[PDB]
Symmetry: C5
Subunit: 255 residues, 5 copies
Amino acid sequence: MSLLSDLCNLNLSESTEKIIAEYIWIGGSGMDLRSKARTLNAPVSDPSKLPQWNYDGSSTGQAPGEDSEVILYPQAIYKDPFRRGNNILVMCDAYTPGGEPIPTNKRFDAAKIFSHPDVVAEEPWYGIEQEYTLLQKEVKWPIGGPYYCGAFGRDIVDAHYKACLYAGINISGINGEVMPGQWEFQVGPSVGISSGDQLWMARYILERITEIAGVVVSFDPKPGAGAHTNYSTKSMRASNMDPYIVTSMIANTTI
Amino acid sequence: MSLLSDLCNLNLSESTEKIIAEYIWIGGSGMDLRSKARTLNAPVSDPSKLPQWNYDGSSTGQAPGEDSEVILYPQAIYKDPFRRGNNILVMCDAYTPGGEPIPTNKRFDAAKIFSHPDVVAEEPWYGIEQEYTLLQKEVKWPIGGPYYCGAFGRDIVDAHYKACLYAGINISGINGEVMPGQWEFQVGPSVGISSGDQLWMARYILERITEIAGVVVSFDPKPGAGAHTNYSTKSMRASNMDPYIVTSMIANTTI
Amino acid sequence: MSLLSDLCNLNLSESTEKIIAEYIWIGGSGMDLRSKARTLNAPVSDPSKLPQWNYDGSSTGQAPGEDSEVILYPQAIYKDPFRRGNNILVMCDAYTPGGEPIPTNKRFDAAKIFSHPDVVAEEPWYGIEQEYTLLQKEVKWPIGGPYYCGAFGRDIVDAHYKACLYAGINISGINGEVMPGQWEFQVGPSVGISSGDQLWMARYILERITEIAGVVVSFDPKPGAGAHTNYSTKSMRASNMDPYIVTSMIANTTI
Amino acid sequence: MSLLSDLCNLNLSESTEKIIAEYIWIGGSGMDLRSKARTLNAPVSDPSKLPQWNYDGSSTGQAPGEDSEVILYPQAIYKDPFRRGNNILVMCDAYTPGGEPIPTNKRFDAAKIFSHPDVVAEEPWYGIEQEYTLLQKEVKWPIGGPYYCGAFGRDIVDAHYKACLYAGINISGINGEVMPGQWEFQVGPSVGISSGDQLWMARYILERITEIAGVVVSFDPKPGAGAHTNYSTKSMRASNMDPYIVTSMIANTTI
Amino acid sequence: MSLLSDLCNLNLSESTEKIIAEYIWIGGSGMDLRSKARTLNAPVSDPSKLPQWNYDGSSTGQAPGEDSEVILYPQAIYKDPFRRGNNILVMCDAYTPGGEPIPTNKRFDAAKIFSHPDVVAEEPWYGIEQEYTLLQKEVKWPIGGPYYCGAFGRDIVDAHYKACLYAGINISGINGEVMPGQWEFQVGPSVGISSGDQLWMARYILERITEIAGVVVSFDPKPGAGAHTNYSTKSMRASNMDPYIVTSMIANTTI
């Protein structure tokens, strides 16, 4: 009657060489996030050598009826916090076939903004601040002053923090809040496009951890959960809003 | 009081040398599968050295009442997910006595098709796609549009994926879809009769996963579901149907 | 809580040199087995060096009330698949005071039969098949035709099989059957009195695994189940009956 | 909760050098025991170096109101069941300050009896038989003919045996009886005052194991549970009564 | 639910060098205790290189509504029993901005008292005597004369002891009491301000252990529970009262 926990943790270096990999892309609605997996071969740490892939976009909800096929590309390579070992999560972005951004991409524009000379000569360290809430599934409300930096499912938050440490993303620090079940973590001085990458990946990791643990987070402005973006520069040195938009617009407007 | 999982997991290289082996043969209905186990002496990787063994055919149903004796042969030798250690599994095929195929064999015809000089020189690969739904025991209804890679019940599929990786199966990747609880995976470039072997072994492994967990899988097309074929060859390079037939009929017709 | 298995699964080489040893003898009805444990000093594989012991025969129910003293001899040197380590299980033979066999012994007669020059001349290897059923506490009925090699508490059976492999009993393979809950396993190569030894040890091990996992069994044919004998001789090379009677009558009559 | 067991099982030498030690003494009723803990600095096996300590005797009930102070001396150096590692237990005895034994001590008289030249030259060994019952917490009835060396909470007995084998109590075999829940165990060639020391230690370990598991023992003459003295000197070679009395009266009267 | 224990416990040296660190400060009410965390780069045992910090005083209840900033400093070097690894805890203290004491600071007074030339030459050791109670999470009453160490969740106390041993606290021994669920532990020789710091951090450790266990403690004078200090100086060498006050008032009055 065990929840298969004897499995799901097998060592792979003793049986085979193939390593699983999952492809995560932004969904059609702008906040939905969906993924499916494929095997791979001998591990490498260079995203350029990973093969491309596609999927059915109209089924997700970001591609037309006839042009469901929308290609994705590999650019970010990290570790896996739910199937340990050498398994890898890769943050792929949605594209209408032919190289042009999909209508709901908002990734190529950020790439060109942060690759523009006035920005790439600088170091747009965007320590964006993200905060959320952990309610439930059965009641969709938080468990149960002192709550700020306080005791409602702290194990979930500790698991998320340690999984983020393990994965390799740049996270800095967790913090509680007065409103029940509310926390926030800092990602520190990372590149704006990279900062959007880690924000999306960390939201996915949180969603998976909660669904494992028996709860669901609600990334909404009011469950208050929002976003604030700090800016660091070479000269200096909403809970569902797109991180690339806020990070890129600061780089575009300020520079 | 019910903790016996300390058993079922004992190391073998410290007490004895015997290694279990379970014989897997296709049942009478063509989709039902039966199996029983027997010891061995020493580890080996050559299927030709394994001894033969039989069973009572009329009890299973695919043999006559008086001719219940159904000789089986060893062809497949791969590890076991649910007993670990150094155990093996074999995908034996049903045969009438004297080397003649049983009425529900569908193994010798595909073997001779893929051993035909034209086909064997062709060396074709078949990434057969298989679709199914994991329903339940207590309700026998799917676990759970937006469901396409969107959630609950993923752990059974993760366990099955990792068990297939642990075994010798060549699997590719799970694709959650719109139908609740319904998932899917591709096999990949496997050589015909081999592709049928891995499809049957993977179906058995998933059946044991589900009966361990507490769910029941109905592979039938409409409990929709179907089967497709992939044809890659050196010249150019129903969800419950026999993999040998589809991979060989395209081998026979095209070649 | 209820976590006691940390103590149950301790190691002794880090603390002491004393090793437990459990003494098993045939009960009064001819099918019940009573036993307790006695400590020792150093491990050994020679049954002739073990100490002797005696119990209260009248309390058990196979000796006179006043002459309850029933000496027991050591026969078996095999490991314990419930406490592991260097723990051992030892056979015992009920005897009347003075070296004469107890009325319900049926062990010395088989010993002298298989020690006869004729029987030892034609080496009596005995493969014995034994059949049982899995009942339950609340119903005392099988868990839950097609059931032949199909699962009703397969974990109990896998545990028993692996424990038997660990504990030195020469078992050859389990075989699920048509009757719900009903299974059966073959013994294989075993020399007569030895065959009775492994049959009795395997029955005791199954009983203890059923009590550990919390489940009840009935080895009787109809709580139909039965047993057969095989005679592998050098010359040409009831589910609850005493193995010694069965394995020796064919040895005596044929040889 | 699934946690609290990793904490209880933390290794000691990884962080600090301090080792806990608990002080167990005979309570007011003569059968009850009381224990609280102190730290230490370095491991040692010589009882002559452990520091003295006292307590409040009026609260316990074996000291006068004004002279609640009751010094306790270090007696035994043996390990701990539930805090394994380098934790040790000491069997301290009650004493009115100034060297005068408490009326409920009954330990100094046995010391002087076994320290008398005739007895100490006799070297008397006492394999005392102790029998108890494992019923339950609340109902206080047995947990869960054939019962004599039988299936009523056997795990408790196995745990108690394996804990008693922690480099210490010279237990020499466990035993069951017809009375449900009833059990008993025997000690080896214990030297006089030791026999009482190990009997009290084993009773305390059994008490804590039962309270952890979920049962309560009831050491009463009629749960019938009693005791028997055994005498064996160099010349010749009640379930709740004080062991020191019985092991010394046979020492004093015979020698 | 069976998962998350593989989580919350991942190894860090395998993936990233970053180590989490949590900042605990005294709350506004005088007994509330709240904390947030942020990562670092490399381990160190020198409490002079860690970064600075601040938080929301008005939300917590310490600083005015407008000037809510409450600056904090690092001074403690310890470890975490709830996350293990190289994780550390620091006992920061509340200030008004600019280095001036906050109204509920009670740090500079004790620091100057113990660092006063006469006292620091004396360097008095304070074995504070702290006692508390473990009632319940839901009903806040114990789960259950003879109760004086003669149990109500002893596992919690054992866990707290071993956690305090791991965390580097100079603790010396535990004690029960007749009061239901009432315990206490001694810290023994500790240098002045370190006594108060260690009392506060041990209370925090116990608070998190009890909230993990599903049980709430009450640090109130009568659940009774108090605090008492010792004066073990080289010259002779309630449950919520501030340890610094009691340890420094005796330092100031006597010296």
